């Protein structure tokens with residue numbers, strides 16, 4: 001039993017809710033919140049901008065030190081950093097950005113990072129400003145993640161469509 005509430009169960013291991021991931025993180029304090037990161041960990045907008053703002057920019061400060069030491073992530077890759085006031089840990093995962101021309105097949109590689117964590121609160125990778133089709137992102141998620149994932153979808157209209165079209 002865990003503290004996630006109000007989610008629709010899609011499969012054995014994938015759950016979905018119309019929620020603001022920032023508000024959900026602050027209420028649940030999950031072990032892991034996933035950030036929709038870019039390779040530079042520049043958390044300017046979308047989910048990343050919102051998570052970073054909720055940490056009062058502490059996420060960005062930590063991220064800048066990470067990059068200065070380690071260099072950029074790979075598209076499809078991830079790193080574990082602090083969750084600050086939102087979670088124990090933040091798993092920064094880089095899905096492909098269609099608006100940069102990145103290969104969509106890398107979306108499966110991006111979701112494979114979730115399998116290193118038993119339970120996660122997450123957004124749909126490569127959705128929103130990353131330009132992929134969220135219905136496709138949900139399909140890849142369900143077909144790739146085997147650990148327990150709680151998906152937060154900010155837009156109610158999109159949430160209803162994802163549910164209504166889910167096979």
Ligand SMILES: O=S1(=O)CCC[C@@H](Nc2ncnc3[nH]ccc23)C1
Nearest residue numbers: 021036046047050123127128129154
């Ligand atoms: O274009 S996006 O930002 C790309 C990443 C996922 C979507 N965003 C969110 N999803 C869930 N909670 C959120 N709180 C603030 C933004 C947000 C759309």
